Design a binder for this molecule. Structure first.
Ligand SMILES: CC(C)(COP(=O)(O)O)[C@@H](O)C(=O)NCCC(=O)NCCS
Length: 78
């Protein structure tokens, strides 16, 4: 079982890989809307997290909890 800390790093790493942004633009508290993710990729992230965590999630979960910090808190604490 991942911690919130480990999940925040998984998500920051995913944002970086998915957008090409510099590391300094991706932080735990910035609004996810500022990352320039396509909404296809935002929905794809939910599916990847489903597999990562073994649970069912809303397709739009990352907009619903719109920071890396808030999303990790919600996924680990339900
Ligand atoms: C999340 C989303 C709705 C895409 O939303 P988005 O384009 O805002 O980024 C995607 O998962 C989906 O369900 N459909 C995208 C394309 C589609 O359904 N029809 C194409 C009409 S132009």
């Amino acid at each position: 079982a991942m911690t919130t800390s480990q999940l925040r790093t998984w998500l920051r790493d995913w944002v970086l890989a998915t957008t090409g942004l510099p590391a300094e633009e991706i932080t735990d508290d910035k609004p996810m809307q500022s990352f320039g993710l396509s909404s296809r990729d935002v929905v794809l992230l939910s599916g990847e997290l489903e597999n990562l965590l073994g649970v069912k999630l809303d397709a739009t979960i990352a907009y619903e909890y719109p920071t890396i910090a808030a999303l990790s808190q919600r996924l680990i604490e339900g």
